[PDB]
């Protein structure tokens, strides 16, 4: 039998099949305790556990797709949805530390010490696993991979204890505390093996193809408009038809979708209470836009998200600009004009989406409280479903010697580390590209930079990243 | 606090019944595990274990001194070493030791002293 | 740990070293700081992360941190060097330790 | 083959079958003796033998529930007995400490070294599990479990050498000196298993279910009664007939049950000799409570039992209270009124339990002398039976080097430790709960606290338990 | 209790069925005793129109 590392993805005309290998590290804990939080807020504060355990999050998109292999996805197909994904966790090395005293450190290797496993088939512990946090993956396969401690947040009740206004989250009856070790463990041993082999469910597509025509602007640009437009006002109207010019006051049989609170340059747009309890809804909805490049410059939006970096790295909607979206995009009203800035949802409305780039999120997870509406497509990039892939979760083990009868020998916990290979296996159902009859050479396909610093490619750690994300709307429709 | 008072005969060379006693203020002796120890030390030599007493009765003994003395309690913390026709006179001291949990091995050690009495002999 | 145990002072002439000791349980596994107060003065950050020094701070204070104790070696001390050093840790809210006067 | 780290009890409208896994750690002996004793009393001494064995007690019901577990399983079920038990002894990993002279400790892994089992189906060795001692399981499956080392007491010849009045038990003909060493041996070396697969007794169940009526009150509260009741005495009765108000003089057909020194606020009560020997049997009979709460406060008895803490950690027998039973209960006579405080068997009488908890034991033992009465449960909890699961000891070994021909190199036990996983199974026959034409809401189970501080939870080592024991009476039967 | 029974044990509820049977109809009628002022014997011509 042969043990390998696989990586590479493999096209066709129907899905591709992308796999990554990564090393990962599941490093110590020199306490296996909960240790609950102390947060003690004082302005509704958090209350949190902090489990011993190290889940892993592979979510992203750039490490399924090497910038080759993304760019050979957008210049030939026209949609993406996944369908299934595997994760193997590969050979095993867990091992021992035994603290030379006068070295510091000599790492031999164990064959007793193993490596508790669990994954969350069943949904039985809090999913945190697409939100958008600085700890996914290495971006280059060359480095170590260390994965997450494991800790959720709960709801407990509200106290006010301390002397001027000190707010603390003490437990309540719907508290919970998750023990995860009343499971089942794979204890995965050195040179085990273990898979996890998820199945997606069937998601709507991402489109990743822009459009050659404004919405609003679909008809025949000669012959005018069967239909009327008022001149007078005031209980007599005097309707007047149109000629082939009237195209500002041209009729749409659909509307745009909805603008709420979409401005140009905190907190944001936010809900809550008086002025001060205030929670953020950062990156609006997914029907806005945050950045776009107008007549001279770039517009940046308020409810904007960086992506790293500052001066920032966002994804160039040009998309939704064409498609009577945008930053400053006021909506006007007749009424006895009133500039509003929101946009209602207009029974009839198409807002295309925010686009997805190549370091966007795959799920997230939609809540299980119910009446969800549209909850198809996450912000922050990715899908969202209801049981998404489910949580890996990896604790080594407490090998707890050595005693001596009643001493306290030694260190009781004594040192361990384990080392790895994940194998992360996902394929995309592919969709064929959008038909044109179109003579002129579509744009090429090649990552936003500005001079002299080209994208993903070593320098004299080395490997940069461009200024703008790469987006995924380069072909066009033709709508 | 605990503090532990003890009480001293004085001198008697042939062969009587040394009698000693330690009443222990702070916290009365039938109130939980605890031992109380007769220790003795010799003027320049070191310390000397006689034996100490549980509050139900049960006593152990130094296998040296076994048949000479005798630990009793009426919450009174008595010694009763006979046969002193060995001068030994040193020097009396009581103290307690928490009871330990396995009896392999002493997890205590003896934090309560009393102040000493000087028998002679 | 919870508790940072360090010693009372040390004496030292120009010339040599001063290695002091900041005792405490599992600090190996931890981080430790060290401060440097002058009289009448607030205190500097003299070590940080057990082994790096800051740009204000020169290259002759190095420390360790190994097993249960971390260590601060000051190479060839000048006439200035005469501070109560502390060394800091962080066992969930923050330790500070006693203080070796030098 | 997977190995697995098995937890979690399954429910189904017959028995639940609940497992728990620990890590378990047998230490070390620097002596392989036996060590007799010398208590050498002085007012009946003891005498025993200090084996060099571990056994292990899993005996208390609060580590096959969680406490969602326990709570599901009162206030859906009605009854609950064991049926069969495995104890499953996995991965071995005997170690030894090769002392590093300069660090002190340094533990490699021993492929030689074994773990000697043996497992006393026979039941000839004595038998010192179900009595009720701080050493019994982790209550958390995150903590490492330390077995105890096993010893027993004999039975003598009570001497009288000494000076004042020394007594000592020494060795009689009756005596006995078992050494564990002329058994079988399950040599059990790193990665062995071993299993046990005991067999319950057909027991009685323990009625998960109080009652909402009294029984001295089962009658029509209208109606009176067709029998009469004294009058005027002295040879001449005149007896006169009943209405319904005479509740105080109703005739009842079942008497209650015996109340042996029920008493509020040493030995309790207690056999013995003249007043000093007075061995105690501390929790009364098993038909008695020791703890309920009247108009005002908790009564709380001479004869209870802490379970922790102090301040105590009582069950609250409520349902002892409500049937003629409790603590200030006399019983009175009208012989020529006479108050006693005990009440006899009388019988025709009924009494029902003194109601299990979530920290009862389950099982102790009925000693091997004849005629008995009742014994089918017993106190401290549980139920007690004839053949209990037998005990488990866990040895090590002494490998005994090195030697270099005469000499005694080495410390000739050199040192070795074993840590192992003990996955301990147990299934209980639950009963389905008794019918109810009843149109109330029953009361809720959770778990008694009384402020801020919650039941079974990590606060800021962290989880504690609450202040009364969870008792399993609290839905009514209706009787 | 059976509502009781309902949310401790079970996580969603939604109705599949649904019967309606109207029992053992008994239409009857009054004679107004003139005196007493009602007297209500039994009818078996009456009806009851169910639609």
């Known amino acids: 039998v042969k ?19 990564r090393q990962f590290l599941i490093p110590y804990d020199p306490e296996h305790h909960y240790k609950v939080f102390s947060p003690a807020a004082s302005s509704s504060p958090i209350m949190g556990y902090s489990t011993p355990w190290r889940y892993l999050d592979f979510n992203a998109l750039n490490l399924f797709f090497s910038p080759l292999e993304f760019q050979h996805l957008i210049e030939n197909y026209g949609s993406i949805a996944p369908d299934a994904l595997t994760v193997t966790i590969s050979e095993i090395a867990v091992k021992d530390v035994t603290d030379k005293t006068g070295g510091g ?13 669990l994954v969350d088939h069943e949904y039985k512990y809090p999913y945190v696993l697409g939100q958008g946090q600085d700890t996914l993956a290495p971006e280059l396969p060359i480095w ?3 994965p997450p401690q494991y800790a959720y947040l709960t709801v407990g009740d509200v106290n006010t204890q301390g002397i001027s206004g000190d707010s603390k989250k003490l437990a309540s009856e719907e508290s919970a505390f998750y023990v995860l070790e009343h499971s089942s463990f794979q204890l995965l041993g050195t040179g085990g093996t273990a898979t996890m082999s998820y199945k997606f469910p069937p998601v709507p597509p991402e489109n990743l193809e822009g459009c050659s025509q404004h919405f609003y602007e679909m008809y025949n640009p000669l012959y005018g408009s069967r239909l009327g437009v008022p001149d007078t006002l005031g209980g007599d109207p005097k309707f007047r038809s149109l000629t082939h010019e009237d195209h500002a006051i041209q009729p749409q049989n659909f509307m745009p979708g909805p603008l709420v609170n979409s401005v140009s340059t905190l907190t944001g747009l936010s809900t809550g209470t008086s002025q001060n309890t205030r929670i953020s809804l950062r990156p609006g909805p997914v029907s806005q836009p945050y950045h776009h490049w107008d007549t001279d410059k770039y517009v940046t939006g308020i409810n904007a998200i960086s992506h790293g970096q500052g001066v920032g790295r966002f994804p160039n909607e040009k998309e939704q600009l064409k498609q009577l979206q945008g930053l400053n995009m006021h909506t006007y009203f007749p009424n006895k004009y009133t500039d509003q800035i929101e946009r209602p949802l207009m029974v009839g409305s198409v807002w295309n989406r925010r686009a997805l780039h190549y370091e966007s999120q795959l799920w997230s997870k939609i809540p299980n409280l119910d009446d969800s509406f549209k909850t198809q497509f996450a912000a922050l990039g990715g899908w969202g479903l209801h049981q998404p892939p489910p949580q890996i979760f990896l604790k080594i083990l407490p090998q707890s010697g050595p005693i001596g009868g009643i001493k306290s020998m030694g260190i009781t916990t004594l040192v361990q580390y384990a080392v790895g290979i994940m194998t992360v296996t996902m394929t995309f159902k592919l969709g064929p590209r959008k038909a044109t009859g179109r003579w002129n050479p579509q744009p090429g396909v090649y990552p936003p930079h500005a001079a002299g610093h080209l994208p993903y490619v070593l320098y004299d750690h080395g490997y940069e990243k461009p200024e703008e994300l790469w987006t995924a709307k380069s072909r066009v429709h033709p709508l | 606090q605990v503090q532990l008072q003890e009480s001293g005969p004085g001198l008697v060379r042939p062969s009587q019944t040394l009698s000693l006693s330690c009443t222990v203020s702070g916290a009365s002796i039938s109130s939980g595990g605890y031992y109380w120890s007769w220790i003795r030390q010799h003027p320049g030599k070191g310390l000397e274990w006689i034996g100490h007493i549980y509050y139900s009765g ?10 000479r003395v005798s630990i009793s309690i009426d919450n009174q913390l008595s010694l009763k070493v006979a046969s002193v026709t060995a001068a030994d006179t040193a020097v009396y001291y009581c103290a307690r030791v928490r009871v330990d949990s396995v009896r392999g091995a002493g997890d205590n050690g003896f934090d309560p002293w009393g102040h000493g009495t000087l028998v002679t002999v | 740990a919870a508790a940072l145990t360090q010693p ?27 401060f440097q107060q002058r009289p009448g003065q607030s205190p500097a950050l003299l070590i940080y992360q057990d082994n790096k020094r800051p740009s204000g701070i020169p290259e002759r204070f190095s420390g360790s941190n190994s097993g249960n104790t971390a260590t601060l070696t000051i190479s060839g001390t000048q006439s200035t060097d005469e501070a109560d050093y502390y060394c800091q840790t962080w066992d969930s809210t923050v330790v500070f330790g006693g203080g070796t006067k030098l």
Chains 1, 4 share one sequence.
């Open chain 1, 144 to 146: 170590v991979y260390f």
């Open chain 1, 3 to 21: 043990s390998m590392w696989s990586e590479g993805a493999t096209f066709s005309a129907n899905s591709v099949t992308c796999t990554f290998s």
């Open chain 3, 8 to 34: 009372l002072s040390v004496s030292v002439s120009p010339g040599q070293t001063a290695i002091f000791t900041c005792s405490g349980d599992n600090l190996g596994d931890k981080y430790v700081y060290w």
């Open chain 1, 105 to 117: 450190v000599q790492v031999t290797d164990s064959t007793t010490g193993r490596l508790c496993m």
């Open chain 2, 58 to 67: 049960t006593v152990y003994y130094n296998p040296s001194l076994r048949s």
